[PDB]
Design a protein around this ligand. Structure first.
Ligand code: NA
Length: 461
């Protein structure tokens, strides 16, 4: 990803976009009951905590484009992945406006709380004013599609979330690149069935985990993985993607019956963005908030890993590459041991910056004991080994519970954390509940006890 140019929006015919400047994150009733070191991300260039230029920091993720065209290894990767996806008999017909808007089997309705993007955000028009969940009315949307068309600028907002102290000082805030509601709708109409097929088929065939339920999926993953696991982290994955990776994605789409609308991919690759009073053009880089971000990043990850394996290990048997991606996150395997360090080396030539799994300083062997996926470890249940626990460390949960974005959601927020935490065991879960109940807010919540969650879990399979 690389920014071609950036300049005042008015110079290119666009209005200034108002973006919040104050975090909605504030210390929760549990702020001093649990340990934590994260704080709300910087949202404005004048944040006191900043120790470097803000604008430069948030856009530094665009490290450039290392590759121009699709080489032979990538083409091979494309053929293998596409051939694999072919076995799913994915429905290639366009999805009707109604379902694209309000959902159908395998595709949730459009999120009504998130930005409607340009130009709606500039006309003070919300999604709630356009969509009718009980009516499933498409008239207003259709009228808007005809009026403002598609391929509209993506509206950039700084993401309001917790970040390490280092990332706050270095202005390393993440960005939300919201595609207009029109584009989102058009893309779900174009690829709606592809998305549904992926959501209904998490595993090693789609090579994707999007739409998965960790509580149930964790027990299925091992049986899908090979003998030897391998994994690694990406530094700024989305933004590092070069145009060639988007072209490779289109080839996959053409081969599986969607050649009909690969043009939509161009809109993602060569994209137009609005931020505050500036507009900028990016070549490469996956936009962070459009309908399909996760899925397309996952598909591209499948192409990347196959490519690096072909480039590094000629003769590799991709039919025995078993991987599951979720955007940039990935858990992979092969019958034979592979060197992630070598793969990482091959990765640089493709514009990818790969580092040791889970922030290790060195590339170590990945085992079922130390591997993580979506920040969750895998642990066989003590009583029924065949049931696998997705174990998210308490550290993350403690960090999260120390802040709130709305006192009215305290109950939901804390229940959510409980669904993640109990997997750490009864002793730990009870210590968590007790601390929660050491303050009034926590004592007034209705939280499930350990045995309740365990029973609920066994009854969910
Ligand atoms: Na882009």
């Amino acid at each position: 990803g690389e920014i071609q140019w950036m300049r005042p929006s008015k110079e290119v015919g666009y209005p200034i976009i108002n973006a919040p400047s104050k975090t909605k994150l504030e210390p929760s009733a549990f702020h001093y009951v649990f340990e934590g070191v994260k704080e709300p991300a910087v949202l404005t260039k004048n944040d006191p905590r900043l120790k470097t230029d803000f604008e430069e920091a948030i856009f530094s993720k665009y490290v450039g484009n290392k590759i121009t065209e699709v080489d032979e290894y990538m083409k091979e990767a494309v053929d293998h992945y596409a051939g694999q996806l072919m076995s799913l008999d994915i429905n290639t017909e366009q999805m009707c406006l109604e379902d694209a808007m309000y959902g159908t089997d395998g595709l949730e309705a459009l999120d009504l709380s998130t930005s409607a993007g340009y130009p709606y955000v500039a006309m003070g028009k919300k999604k709630r004013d356009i969509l009718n969940k009980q009516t499933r009315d498409t008239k207003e949307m259709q009228k808007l599609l005809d009026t403002y068309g598609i391929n509209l600028p993506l509206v950039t907002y700084v993401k309001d979330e917790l970040r390490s102290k280092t990332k706050v000082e270095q202005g390393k805030s993440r960005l939300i690149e919201a595609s207009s509601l029109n584009d989102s709708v058009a893309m779900r109409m174009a690829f709606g069935n592809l998305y549904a097929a992926f959501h209904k088929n998490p595993g090693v065939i789609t090579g994707s985990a999007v739409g998965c339920d960790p509580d149930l999926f964790w027990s299925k993953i091992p049986v899908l993985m090979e003998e030897k696991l391998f994994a690694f982290d990406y530094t700024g994955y989305d933004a590092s993607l070069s145009p060639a990776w988007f072209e490779a994605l289109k080839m996959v789409l053409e081969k599986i019956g969607f050649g009909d609308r690969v043009d939509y991919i161009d809109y993602l690759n060569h994209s137009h963005h609005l931020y505050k009073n500036k507009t900028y053009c990016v070549k490469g880089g996956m936009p962070s908030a459009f309908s399909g971000t996760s899925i397309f990043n996952s598909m591209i990850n499948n192409l990347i890993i196959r490519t690096l394996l072909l480039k590094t290990y000629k003769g590799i048997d991709l039919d025995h590459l078993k991987m599951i991606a979720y955007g940039d996150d990935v858990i992979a395997s092969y019958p034979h041991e592979v060197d992630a360090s070598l793969l990482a080396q091959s990765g640089k030539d493709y514009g990818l910056t790969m580092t040791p799994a889970d922030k290790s300083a060195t590339f170590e062997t990945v085992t079922w004991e130390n591997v993580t996926f979506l920040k969750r470890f895998f642990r066989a249940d003590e009583k029924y080994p065949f049931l696998i626990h997705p174990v998210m460390p308490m550290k993350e949960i403690h960090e999260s519970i120390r802040w709130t974005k709305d006192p009215r959601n305290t109950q939901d927020h804390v229940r959510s954390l409980c669904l993640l935490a109990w997997h750490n065991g009864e002793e730990e879960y009870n210590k968590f509940l007790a601390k929660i109940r050491s303050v009034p807010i926590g004592r007034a919540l209705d939280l499930p006890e350990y045995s309740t969650l365990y029973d609920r879990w066994l009854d969910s399979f």
